[PDB]
Design a protein around this ligand. Structure first.
Ligand SMILES: [Zn+2]
Ligand SMILES: [Zn+2]
Ligand SMILES: [Zn+2]
Ligand SMILES: [Zn+2]
Ligand SMILES: [Zn+2]
Lengths: 193, 48, 252, 134, 48, 48, 44, 64, 98, 192
């Protein structure tokens, strides 16, 4: 678990959704960053309250089920199979699935991932996550993430996230990154326009 | 309302309903070839 | 009955006429469904009596041009009554006539007992008695007849205009609502309303004529009309073109 | 004798002319369905059934039908489509609905409901299919 | 293969269901075949 | 597309028949049924 | 469920239970109104 | 039923000439003279107007 | 002039307006196929179901044609395998099955 | 993913002879020191509109520290052929985080019955033999006090096969046969 921050960066001007990622990723490459593979984050939804199940590719076997403010269960992939078996019993929702797919760039112990939350078949928006694997402590590693973001992100740099929340010596968790992703996804689904 | 032994629609003679199997050869409608019954005539009868 | 799927609902198919498990696709049954049918795309005494009753029912129905649906309902009612056998002592003709009357009532186009008798050799009294017995045997009931039920037929047989028919229907319904004809038969009330409307419109029909079509004596029509006459302006529809003013309507 | 495709009483047609409506036609097919209350408890009624209410139904979609069990005009209808949804009460209610010809693929042109000579409700549905020369 | 006495009908074979399968009409009203009706006739007469 | 020919699966044609099965009945050319050594028939469109 | 009278061309709502008949005309031939669902035609 | 928009053979616009053709016929032009005035030179186009039957006019006599 | 090449056709074609009629016989209404389709109750033989898939009659003339061809396997297929294949268990001692 | 079918044969041993069976299993099985596991299992049922309640079995290992809770779904019996002489059920095995109890309750699954199982686990090839003494749990929540459901211990032979091919039951029947004089392991239907 390494402190992470995810924010949405608007494409701006008349730059196409893809055109902006191409440019932002080249700007990241212009940090001496080297590509270290590909990352896929695919999330499905249920209208039950509301259930969310998300799975970052960075984690090979885990599937995360988050119940809004309620607890997140980090479970094996067989969890998706249990979900499908229950499916007739379970609620399904209507094409609310949201995915962000983009390149992973490594810059000396910081992994930066810029992706386009493509809703369904049509892209709309952009998610940036900067993670620090060495920084086990969180909520005060904010100075680091902020300085690195001002280096590359510049404008639209986020003024923290609430997943850090109350000041505590509590260690950062894979659950916290998933909660950041869920808030970001709720915003793309509803930003509209 | 159910098949009865010794009746015309004897379940032994074959399958009654499509989603069913006869008790003799335990075969479905397609597999079961149908099995003959017999009637004892109290008096001998000529054959036309 | 998919072997690998305990309690699996097999979906029917029309292309091959087979039932197939939807989750694996296994074909359970080769050509078992018979899509041709599934997809629509010496006489016994009792049966002979029933056949004669059906023939009589058809004759009576055609006498007054009743629809085949009413005929079929009458046939079903007669079958039920005849098998129930509580009316075995009564004539099959009377049972058939009462069944025809009940079928008309249930279909919502009631015919008067006199109307049924006009087409049946059985008398009105016997028809009514058999009707009561049939109702008891069937443990069913028939909605109470209203004046509006007979207006269409009576006005059409009298060849009155649609406006006159509407005026008569409104007059009868309003009279029943106001309770100006308590206890009076609906047929009598309808005949009186039709007479009022006819006398207020250009097409004027005599009491004898209206009684002839409606099956009601001119004296009964006179009584009902006298009961509804004082409030004729109230009964008449607002937008009615009075050829004869309501004040100058016949007084009798 | 242009290309040999008109040989032996055959004909070569101008595709551009056909595109311009040349010898184009309508095919109207009328389906009549009557609901009959004949039988002690065997009655037929026009209505859109349900996959569970009836004794048995089909994979064909019944969403085309309306609350009265009749397909509205202007709706495209192809094979395995229900145009009239009928239910006959089982002596549940068995599905007695009617389908179209699988090859036929047209639009419901006119739907009329009336009482036949027998006084039973019945509906006539005229389906319109456009035949372009081919 | 053929004895003259066998020509006289003493035991009457009953065709299987597949030979004279029961039909369904007007819903679930099982329409028994003509063979079923005739077999009912012989059964009644034989019992009598 | 409506008419089909049953081809026996061989190492010579295993890949081609697998591709046809993957295409399925939806898009021509494809396949309609798969028959296992058990002789049972599987409907491809019902099972994708 | 709107039906158009075949004689006077009057729209009227009708349920599955009430008889099929014009509310004012009395005419017994009814035509269903065109579906609200929109169908696309290629102008070919 | 109604005058075709295009000549079936060559595709010339022919759907806007029916009313003018009828007007000329009323003005006593011979059919050939009216076609020439309308500018239909090819006999393929002339056939459109010459052999057209306007059934829509009678179809409109039935109440909608 | 040839449409494909634009070259004048050597022979001069006879061309003019003629009144043609479109007959009701369309290939759409006549095309029909049958491949492993529904069968009837008793005969277990093909019958058209929910479509025009009732199959084609392999008549006595076709049987004689295949006999003349000598294609015994194809004839057996058409009359037995394609129409209503069936297998029964029969006792060797007494020919009647059970 | 392919589904995982569990082949199960269940039998009982009275306590007096437990020592003989333990020695015997050690000899036939692979040479591994005995596991001596202790675990707490709570079954959750979902009372939805469908009459059958979904049953998910949640297991926590009290004895083994730092080991994740295991959640499993057990399908209806698929036993058909008499020759197989085994009970076949569909099974999905998923390791879950400690916050499993809360997630299930918020989802709507309801805790029903809880038991604590203590005993020895031994394995031969894929086959796993578990010998355990089920203990009833009293008081609404706790594991401090347990009473014995029976003097005897259930012995279950379980294989989590991939569902590819078969003859898995045959191997199980042969192994069961050896323990048959010491204890009759047979397929006992859950019903009554
Ligand atoms: Zn059998
Ligand atoms: Zn299956
Ligand atoms: Zn009208
Ligand atoms: Zn032209
Ligand atoms: Zn033998």
């Amino acid at each position: 678990m390494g402190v992470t921050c995810v924010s949405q960066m608007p494409v701006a001007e008349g730059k196409s959704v893809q055109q902006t990622v191409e440019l932002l990723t080249r700007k990241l490459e212009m940090l001496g960053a080297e590509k270290q593979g590909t990352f896929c984050v695919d999330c499905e939804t249920y209208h039950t309250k509301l259930m969310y199940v998300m799975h970052n590719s960075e984690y090979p076997l885990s599937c995360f089920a988050l119940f809004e403010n309620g607890p997140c269960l980090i479970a094996d992939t067989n969890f998706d199979v249990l979900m499908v078996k229950l499916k007739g019993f379970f609620q399904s929702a209507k094409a609310s699935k949201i995915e962000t797919r983009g390149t992973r760039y490594q810059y000396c112990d910081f992994l930066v991932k810029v992706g386009t939350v493509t809703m369904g078949p049509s892209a709309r928006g952009i998610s940036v996550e900067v993670e620090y694997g060495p920084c086990v402590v969180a909520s005060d590693c904010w100075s680091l993430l902020l300085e690195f973001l001002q280096s590359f992100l510049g404008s639209h740099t986020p003024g923290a996230p609430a997943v850090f929340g109350n000041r505590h010596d509590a260690v950062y968790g894979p659950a916290d990154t998933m909660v950041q992703y869920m808030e970001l996804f709720n915003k793309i689904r509803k930003q509209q326009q | 309302g159910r098949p009865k032994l010794g009746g015309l629609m004897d379940p032994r003679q074959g399958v009654i309903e499509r989603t069913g199997r006869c008790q003799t050869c335990a075969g479905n409608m397609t597999e079961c070839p149908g099995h003959f019954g017999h009637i004892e005539l109290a008096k001998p009868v000529f054959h036309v | 009955t998919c072997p690998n799927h305990p309690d699996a609902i097999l979906v029917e198919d029309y292309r091959a006429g087979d039932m197939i498990c939807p989750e694996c696709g296994l074909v359970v049954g080769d050509r078992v469904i018979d899509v041709g049918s599934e997809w629509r795309t010496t006489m016994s005494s009792s049966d002979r009596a029933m056949m004669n009753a059906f023939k009589e029912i058809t004759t009576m129905a055609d006498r007054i041009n009743l629809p085949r649906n009413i005929v079929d309902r009458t046939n079903n009612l007669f079958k039920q009554v005849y098998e129930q056998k509580s009316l075995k002592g009564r004539a099959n003709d009377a049972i058939a006539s009462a069944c025809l009357y009940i079928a008309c009532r249930q279909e919502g186009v009631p015919r008067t007992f006199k109307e049924i008798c006009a087409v049946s050799r059985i008398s009105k009294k016997e028809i009514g008695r058999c009707f009561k017995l049939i109702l008891k045997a069937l443990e069913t009931s028939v909605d109470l007849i209203t004046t509006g039920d007979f207006m269409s037929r009576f006005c059409s047989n009298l060849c009155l205009p649609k406006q006159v028919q509407m005026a008569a229907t409104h007059i009868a319904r309003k009279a029943v609502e106001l309770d100006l004809v308590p206890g009076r038969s609906p047929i009598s009330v309808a005949a009186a309303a039709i007479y009022m409307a006819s006398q207020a419109s250009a097409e004027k029909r005599t009491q004898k004529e209206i009684g002839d079509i409606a099956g009601v004596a001119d004296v009964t029509i006179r009584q009902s009309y006298r009961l509804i006459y004082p409030r004729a302006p109230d009964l008449f529809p607002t937008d009615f073109k009075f050829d004869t003013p309501v004040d100058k309507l016949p007084q009798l | 004798s242009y290309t040999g495709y008109n040989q032996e009483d055959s004909v070569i047609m101008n595709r551009s002319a056909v595109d311009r409506g040349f010898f184009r036609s309508v095919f109207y097919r009328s389906y009549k369905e009557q609901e009959s209350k004949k039988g002690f408890d065997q009655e037929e009624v026009f209505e859109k059934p349900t996959r569970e209410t009836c004794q048995g139904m089909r994979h064909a979609i019944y969403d085309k039908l309306d609350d009265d069990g009749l397909i509205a005009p202007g709706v495209r209808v192809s094979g395995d489509d229900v145009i009239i949804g009928k239910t006959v009460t089982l002596p549940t209610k068995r599905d007695c609905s009617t389908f179209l010809r699988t090859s036929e693929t047209g639009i419901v042109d006119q739907v009329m409901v009336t009482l036949n000579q027998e006084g039973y409700k019945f509906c006539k549905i005229r389906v319109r299919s456009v035949r372009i020369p081919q | 293969y053929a004895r003259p006495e066998w020509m006289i009908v003493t035991v009457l074979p009953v065709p299987p269901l597949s030979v004279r399968p029961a039909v369904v009409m007007q819903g679930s009203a099982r329409n028994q075949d003509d063979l079923t009706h005739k077999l009912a006739d012989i059964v009644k007469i034989n019992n009598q | 597309a409506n008419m089909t020919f049953a081809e026996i699966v061989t190492p010579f044609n295993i890949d081609r028949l697998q591709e046809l099965v993957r295409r399925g009945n939806s898009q021509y050319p494809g396949a309609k049924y798969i028959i296992r050594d058990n002789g049972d028939r599987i409907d491809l469109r019902f099972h994708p | 469920m709107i039906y158009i009278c075949g004689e006077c061309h009057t729209e009227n709502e009708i349920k599955s239970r009430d008889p099929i008949r014009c509310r004012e005309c009395g005419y017994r031939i009814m035509y269903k109104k065109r579906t609200k669902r929109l169908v696309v035609f290629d102008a070919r | 039923m109604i005058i075709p928009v295009r000549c079936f053979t060559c595709g010339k616009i022919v759907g806007n000439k029916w009313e003018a053709y009828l007007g000329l016929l009323q003005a006593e032009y011979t059919e050939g003279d009216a076609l020439d005035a309308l500018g239909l030179k090819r006999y393929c186009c002339r056939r459109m107007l010459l052999a057209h039957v306007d059934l829509i006019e009678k179809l409109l006599n039935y109440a909608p | 002039y040839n449409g494909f090449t634009g070259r004048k056709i050597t022979s001069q074609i006879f061309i003019g307006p003629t009144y043609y009629q479109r007959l009701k016989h369309m290939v759409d209404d006549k095309i029909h196929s049958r491949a492993r389709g529904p069968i009837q109750i008793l005969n277990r033989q093909p019958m058209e179901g929910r479509s025009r898939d009732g199959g084609l009659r392999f008549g006595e003339m076709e049987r004689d044609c295949q006999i003349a061809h000598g294609a015994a396997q194809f004839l057996r297929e058409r009359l037995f395998e394609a129409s209503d294949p069936y297998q029964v268990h029969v006792c060797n001692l007494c020919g009647i099955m059970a | 993913t392919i589904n995982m079918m569990e082949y199960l044969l269940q039998g009982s041993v009275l306590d007096h002879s437990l020592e003989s069976l333990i020695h015997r299993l050690r000899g036939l099985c692979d040479n591994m020191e005995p596991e001596t596991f202790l675990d707490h299992e709570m079954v959750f049922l979902l009372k939805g509109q469908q009459a059958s309640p979904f049953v998910l079995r949640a297991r926590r290992s009290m004895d083994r520290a730092g080991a994740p809770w295991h959640l499993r779904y057990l399908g209806q019996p698929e036993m058909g052929d008499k020759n197989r002489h085994a009970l076949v059920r569909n099974c999905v095995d998923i390791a879950t985080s400690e916050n499993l109890t809360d997630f299930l309750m918020e989802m709507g699954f309801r805790m029903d019955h809880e038991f604590v199982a203590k005993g020895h686990l031994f394995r031969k090839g894929i086959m796993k033999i578990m010998v355990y003494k089920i203990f009833r749990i009293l008081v609404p929540g706790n594991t401090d006090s347990t009473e014995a459901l029976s003097l005897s211990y259930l012995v279950e032979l379980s294989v989590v096969a991939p569902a590819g091919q078969d003859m898995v039951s045959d191997d199980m029947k042969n192994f069961a046969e050896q323990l048959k004089p010491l204890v009759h392991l047979e397929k006992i239907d859950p019903k009554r």
